[PDB]
Subunit: 398 residues, 4 copies
Amino acid sequence: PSLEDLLFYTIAEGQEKIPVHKFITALKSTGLRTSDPRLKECMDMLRLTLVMLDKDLFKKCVQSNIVLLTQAFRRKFVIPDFMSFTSHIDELYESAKKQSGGKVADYIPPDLWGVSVCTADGQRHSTGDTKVPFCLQSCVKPLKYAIAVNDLGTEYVHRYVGKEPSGLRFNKLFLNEDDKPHNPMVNAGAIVVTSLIKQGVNNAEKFDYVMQFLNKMAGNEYVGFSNATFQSERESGDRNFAIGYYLKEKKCFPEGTDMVGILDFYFQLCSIEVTCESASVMAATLANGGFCPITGERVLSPEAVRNTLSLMHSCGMYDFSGQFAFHVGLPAKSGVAGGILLVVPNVMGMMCWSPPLDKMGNSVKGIHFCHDLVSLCNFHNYDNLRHFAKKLDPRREG
Amino acid sequence: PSLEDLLFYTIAEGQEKIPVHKFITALKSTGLRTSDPRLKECMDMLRLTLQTTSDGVMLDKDLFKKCVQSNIVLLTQAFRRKFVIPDFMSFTSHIDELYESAKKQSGGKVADSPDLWGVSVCTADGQRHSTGDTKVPFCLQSCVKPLKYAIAVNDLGTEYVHRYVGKEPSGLRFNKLFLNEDDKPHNPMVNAGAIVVTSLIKQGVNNAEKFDYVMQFLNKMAGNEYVGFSNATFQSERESGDRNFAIGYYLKEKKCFPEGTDMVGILDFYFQLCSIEVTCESASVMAATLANGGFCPITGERVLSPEAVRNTLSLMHSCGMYDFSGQFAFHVGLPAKSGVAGGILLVVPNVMGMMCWSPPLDKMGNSVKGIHFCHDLVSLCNFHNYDNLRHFAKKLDPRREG
Amino acid sequence: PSLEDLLFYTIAEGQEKIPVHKFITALKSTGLRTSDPRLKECMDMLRLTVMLDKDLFKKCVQSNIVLLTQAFRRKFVIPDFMSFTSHIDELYESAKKQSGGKVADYISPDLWGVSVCTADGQRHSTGDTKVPFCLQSCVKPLKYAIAVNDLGTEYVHRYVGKEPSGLRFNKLFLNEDDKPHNPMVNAGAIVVTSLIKQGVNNAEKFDYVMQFLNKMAGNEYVGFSNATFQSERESGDRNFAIGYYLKEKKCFPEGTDMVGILDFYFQLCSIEVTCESASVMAATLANGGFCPITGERVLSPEAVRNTLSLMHSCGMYDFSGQFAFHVGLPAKSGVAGGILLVVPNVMGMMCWSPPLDKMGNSVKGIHFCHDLVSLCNFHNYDNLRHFAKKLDPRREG
Amino acid sequence: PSLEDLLFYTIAEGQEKIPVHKFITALKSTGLRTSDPRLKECMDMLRLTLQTTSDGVMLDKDLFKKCVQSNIVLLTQAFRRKFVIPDFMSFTSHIDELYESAKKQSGGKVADYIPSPDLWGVSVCTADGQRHSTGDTKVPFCLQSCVKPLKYAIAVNDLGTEYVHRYVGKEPSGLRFNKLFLNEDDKPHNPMVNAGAIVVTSLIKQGVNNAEKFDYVMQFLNKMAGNEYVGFSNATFQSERESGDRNFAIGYYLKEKKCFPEGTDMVGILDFYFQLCSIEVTCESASVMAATLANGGFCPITGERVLSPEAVRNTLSLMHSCGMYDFSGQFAFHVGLPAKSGVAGGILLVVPNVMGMMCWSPPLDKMGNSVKGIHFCHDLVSLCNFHNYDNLRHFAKKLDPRRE
Ligand SMILES: Nc1nnc(OC2CCN(c3nnc(N)s3)CC2)s1
Ligand SMILES: Nc1nnc(OC2CCN(c3nnc(N)s3)CC2)s1
């Protein structure tokens, strides 16, 4: 016995040869895409091969990659029937497509809508306008927070920022009662954690450090930059300057920080570009303890991915985050571009994008989707995996 | 094949009889106690079989076959380590370390002769462990606000109960307001909110009959372990409820009760509810019912709708520790509710419930030795609600093998 | 040479006989009524008696002639009194015809009345001045004045603050020192109600206030409407919340019967007045605590200062900041439609029209006090030397 | 009968000539100083007669007649005890007792964020020009926050009430919502808080550069002070450029909520604002500016009309409401006088229709007001019926220096 051989006739269907055309169709229906970084040496050893393969031919194509190839074919992934799962994701996408309401962030203008999924095991699925780039806006506030506590630790990062939400009373306060901004996912907090990344180095390269980091969160899928909104947020950041002058005056930055310099760095971070496919993977890195699901590299400390997931829950949808925490119970983060970065812990990462916002700042179709997501699957964080009434569980068989 | 015989050979050690005393000693090290309601038919058919032939007190596979035939689904999963904490007696030795951890924190002042302190656990499968002063009765005080919140949503549905009470915390600035921005109390775990949900249970009937309804409910949440009542603090808390009356009159003026509510009567019912007595063992089981989708773990009966036990666990997370709830939700992330008697009702979803009790409170109203305990609990096990079950650094996972 | 003789030829028109009827017409043009309380010995000793000579005259007015001199020497604080009333009539009628507003939940030729009584007793009314209505929280300064009159500034403010809330905070009960903000919001009024005459029963404290309001109005009309007493006992769920809140945060004097003080509070808010009556109470406040039509001392100078200071800052509920700016007069409104107005050192007034705006102020009342200071230099930070294009009725002209 | 002649015999004491030295000491005893701008033409014709015949310093009825012929309407009401404080030297000896009463109160610490023998001064100028100072009254110090009412007056004087309150409110904050910049109609609360003062700074004489409006404000302050000392201290101007991160924060917040007139350069307005905050005065100088506010906008020692009555009503009314930072509700109640303090140690005091004052001691309490200044203004209305809701008829055991 052993496993490169045993797996050969579970794909082979008893024949003595298998076309490679039925190996890839079998593998792409487990949810993996043939692009998968951890599948490289496997299909590196197959396009140089070219059409049926036999058990000698096969075995030294998959031997280095067969430990994970087995899980896809034994359906021991966290969503085993990933076919059933996507057709409900498509069904959720299409019911959100028909509620027109909202207006776009009027200082960035067929209109568009896309949602992408990437599981903690690398299973991938997109529908709609998934690789059209758009900026993160305040979607990036948890990522730069995660980076911060990854490099500095929980206690340093919260010497400078609090860890709770304000209250619908305090959408116009900057500081809490200990003279820290309330939390990392509101602008006053995001500016301060921007100040703590890679201190002592200049803003040209500490920006690059983040972009190195975002490249590791997306498994090196698309993370770009739009200079259009970088200058356009300097134009119309008179409020962000007030916060900076307020926090400078109230002694809230690490010592020797250049305040008006940090706010510039803040504006570039808010217009890093992604797509929903790219961003789904970074969401999935947060869903999986800080290990990127399509590369296997550990990107963020477990401490950082807990702290981040803890505050995207309470604070991630601006004033709608209390209603969110109640009715959907998933760590999520919205930004003004139309995106919502969604994390179902131990399952999946997601990015939904539709630019029309509501009257609180959340993608209108995005919010409808995440209600329907947890209306139908037991993904809320205070469901029980044993008794869950009339909703489905894609983590099990049929 | 068949499941009663193989279980014989899992315990029988190849020999052809088993002494009756070491079958239960095996089962008692699983974490279940021989008292388990779902084991009663098994031990009925075992100690009157103990005196059928009152010596030769060993069983053969036949006799065994129809002493465990009653509950052989649960008997196998106890002996095959398929409970959600399989090595339950390594786990307790860490619970014991955490008990003794907090035992040496002098601090606190009690709400107006040794140190009282106790913590009990009941897992989602019925496994139990207690340490310290676990069977001494004490009142729930605002520990009961989640339980009665669940009852409200169980009988009425989420959408009705929240026409009358909000679903978010106030803010650590507004710990002095009664109403939010929609003229509802902020949420079920503040007196103003709990008073209003008290008004929603069993409308149209008299207050004696709704009080019996709640306890009738609390008894099935606790698998019918101790649910009592202390009339001493009911009159002592009817004494000093001017603030709550202030809350009551404000809410009447702002039309915040259902139509036809007798407001001044509702407050008396509220003081009654706040001095229902429990122990750490009893409450331990109701926490575990919340830990288990609304099924009582030591009886198997359905107590609360999944809708209700989600809403409850979700607001015990946000709002459950008075002013310390954001700091709690961040550093331990477990649904909890403390009350002024010294209890903390703790839920690890899909694992266990707990009740820790030590009457000395800190300066926010939370049990001093309890808070120290629940920090170290998730400091030590990956039970935080946003840990990962795959990568979690130097922490232990009592849910798995080696 | 004595002053009854001196006053005699000033009236007599050179003749050596004077008709009695041209004397009262002369006296009514100074502003005083013939009913003036410190004028009665004069009008008693001529009502039993139609021309009179100098010995006839002398021994009817020696009685009161120190006060009669100033009416005829035009040394009253408003000397040309009918240029003055003639503008009050113009002010009264400009407010007439602004229909807007709605009445509270109390019980059809729609009513409006304003009366004035100067620091010298000169009086004038127009409209529905002799119809009774309740003070409501118009009474909050009067019971405050009583409290501080009997207890002193420092005791009374061990229990209540001395500033307005914030333009924001009419939905809080206490300030940051755990006192209600000030005596002219319900929470503050309840607690100063708690301080009147403590240790006695509530039937007797209510009589004590009524003894006192009888002295503030020179014994003019102060009655009571039990209809509105019952409606605030009925519809005071609000006030009970305040009482339990204040009882719970230790804000009453010791041995206070909380639920009893609130009933007493509801009684005080349903004391009836008219505009004429209340004009006098306003004028007592305008006059250093001396009732202008009796000469009796009613409130301590300390009390009438403290009171006048907070009707300025706090007297129109949420409109008191704008009020202090645009009219600058101590004033107090209540939900019945009244505004008790004080021009210090000049006059008191009471304006009453039941349609309110939606901050709680008589709509026609507020319009009137805008036009009043929009016309005379009665604002508290006008100058008595250069005052642009408006009137000063304190001089000749 | 002649209007110079009857006055001739009130001083001449029956004698037939008057020495120059007891006409002058008589006039100093009214409260006027002989420097008075509207009396200089009078002393022009006496300092020339002291040299025409070098000895025999005495005047005759005709010589006297046309030395005072010039200003005889004010000279008569000065010698006739027709000033609003007729016994001016009992009044000052009470001011001296109040000054000396406040001087032995140790408390306070100076704002030595911008720094031997304790400084303390108080000066008075009545609505009639009667003058009095004691202590450190001729030492320059900046207005700082004292200037917020004066430039507020200028704004509504040049623009009218409703325009100026198109951009700034007219009530106090409230001590719960005092750490906010805006109210509920998105205007700063009122002209006497930095947020409000910045906005009113933005409205003065727009369209011109900031140097020329600074010259305009100082032209204006000189006519409020009767052309006594109005200076500038560049040292604390630099100390306010360096410690203005809060004010820039205020500036950016207000720029984002559209709170300036259109075409305002916010960052320039902040610099103009810091300039205004370190205009220097002394207690004597500032005394006169207060007295202009006490007198319907007429400068009491020059007789010129400086501010519209509309402007000085509005100003006087908000110095009552808002002028003492967090202590203004307590102030308005216990002294009830329009006032403004600033962090330099000054309190600008107005008793309407009587006098203005400036008290200066740099040690502040823990709300920002002169310790010895506040002590002085309590004792002032403790002793005189100057509170704004006393009565001029019955006022218990208080003094009235306005009457005989
Ligand atoms: N939404 C709401 N509006 N108004 C409310 O009043 C409640 C009762 C009195 N309160 C206080 N008064 N004074 C203090 N120091 S707290 C505030 C809570 S809750
Ligand atoms: N209408 C409005 N007025 N003020 C607003 O917020 C401004 C900026 C931040 N502020 C804080 N003060 N104190 C804190 N801990 S944050 C208050 C000023 S909005």
